[PDB]
Design a protein around this ligand. Structure first.
Ligand SMILES: Nc1ncnc2c1ncn2[C@@H]1O[C@H](COP(=O)(O)OP(=O)(O)NP(=O)(O)O)[C@@H](O)[C@H]1O
Ligand SMILES: N[C@@H](CCC(=O)O)C(=O)O
Ligand SMILES: [Mn+2]
Length: 406
């Protein structure tokens, strides 16, 4: 049975998780066109990148909300609830609102077939259209050029970082990754690049499209009390350090600058003081320090290792689970520079790695039945001066979050 407007959101998600799968955007665009969904707000920012999309978007959101605007954010993936994926004034909507919205997409599509993410994306656009917003922030699902979020013409587009989230493959490198991401840029519009080691293909695509390229360390830059953000001969000085990676706050300032939106000193500082997301180096407890971080590739792992070195005489204990298609070998080698004790767990279903698939990269790691069991063992073993880090995937962090009923 196809669910209805009044069915539980869980029924819609089961229907969408079975959507039988086809490359372009012509289908999703045609549905959007029918439901008049291509202009959710008069200002649209679209954010691509390997790591840093979510926290870049949340910094934009925090600043724009501090400035008194009505703001929507579309985000993915989610930790515990699908309702995390759409925020309006910083807050989630009801499950009922999502079920009604999906029903409208289902009726609106006719016999045009859509993927899970295309359906989610159209529903989000519809929820935003309805909410009378000034700005909509769209986090790219994957890539950008052919991502469902790319049906909307953005006012400013951004790439937060370039890194490899998957294993070696022919033709799969920073250049190929970059090229696909740069497909969110638009002719005549600012294209903000927050990656300091930018592949050439990003510049090639920006040139083909006629986008205006504004790169970190060329057009704008930042440093380090507080921190400083500069673009040409102008700067912001003594900014508060936010609880997101500074590169991504810097990318968000660049977006906001090139958008030409009017923003007070107060809005910028209050936003930076509020900006954070659950599961991005999130301290949940102390003595032992319990930190949750959704790092799942070597680039994020390097960031996570650098933060850990700033917070630990005590041991680092890592509770880890990953998906089987990640660069497991690389992520665990990077983490192993600072992890002293390993607690490995499987993730469920056909896409999860087993604890054995993780252990085979480590030396005499502990192996457990499931994440919660691994985590309770880690807490049980931890001394007061230890750090327990839960990482490797959303599923790992979320299993711990559900177990602490956060
Ligand atoms: N600029 C960055 N450089 C290094 N690591 C980063 C950077 N931005 C984010 N990370 C790390 O990447 C992880 C996720 O950040 P996030 O902002 O959620 O990225 P995302 O692109 O939305 N990916 P996801 O977490 O899978 O939704 C956390 O470990 C971050 O610390
Ligand atoms: N997986 C990324 C690209 C980066 C990568 O493949 O490593 C995406 O979201 O499109
Ligand atoms: Mn994300």
């Amino acid at each position: 049975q196809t669910p209805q407007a009044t069915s539980p959101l869980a029924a819609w998600l089961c229907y969408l998780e079975h959507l039988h799968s086809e490359l372009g955007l012509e289908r999703v665009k045609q549905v959007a066109e029918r439901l008049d969904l291509l202009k959710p707000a008069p200002k649209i920012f679209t954010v691509a990148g390997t790591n840093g999309k979510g926290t870049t978007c949340c910094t934009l959101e925090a600043i724009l909300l501090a400035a008194g605007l009505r703001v929507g954010v579309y985000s993915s993936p989610h930790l515990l609830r699908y309702t995390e994926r759409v925020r309006i004034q910083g807050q989630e909507l009801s499950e009922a609102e999502h079920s009604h919205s999906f029903a409208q997409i289902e009726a609106g599509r006719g016999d045009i077939s859509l993927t899970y993410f295309e359906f989610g994306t159209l529903s989000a656009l519809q929820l935003f259209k309805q909410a009378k917003l000034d700005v909509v922030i769209l986090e790219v699902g994957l890539g950008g050029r052919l991502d469902a979020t790319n049906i909307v013409d953005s006012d400013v587009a951004a790439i937060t970082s370039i890194a490899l989230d998957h294993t070696d493959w022919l033709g799969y490198d920073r250049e190929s990754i970059g090229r696909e991401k740069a497909g969110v840029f638009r002719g005549g519009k600012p294209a903000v690049v927050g990656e300091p080691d930018m592949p050439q293909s990003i510049a090639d695509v920006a040139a083909e499209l006629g986008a205006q390229l504004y790169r970190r360390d060329v057009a704008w830059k930042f440093s380090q009390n507080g921190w400083h953000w500069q673009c040409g001969e102008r700067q912001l000085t003594g900014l508060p350090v936010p609880n997101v990676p500074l590169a991504n706050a810097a990318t968000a300032l660049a977006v906001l600058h090139y958008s030409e939106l009017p923003l007070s000193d107060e809005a910028i500082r209050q936003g930076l003081q509020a900006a954070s997301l659950p599961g991005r180096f999130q301290v949940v407890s102390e003595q032992p320090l319990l930190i949750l971080d959704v790092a799942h590739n070597p680039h994020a792992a390097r960031y996570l290792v650098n933060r850990l070195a700033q917070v630990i005489q005590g041991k680092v204990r890592a509770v880890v689970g990953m998906l089987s298609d990640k660069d497991i070998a690389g992520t665990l080698a990077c983490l192993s520079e600072r992890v002293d004790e390993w607690y490995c767990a499987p993730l469920e279903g056909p896409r999860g790695a087993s604890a054995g698939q993780l252990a085979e990269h480590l030396v005499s790691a502990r192996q457990f039945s499931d994440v919660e069991t691994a985590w309770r063992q880690a807490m049980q073993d931890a001394d007061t001066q230890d750090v327990v880090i839960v990482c490797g995937s959303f599923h790992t962090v979320a299993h711990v979050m559900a177990a602490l009923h956060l």
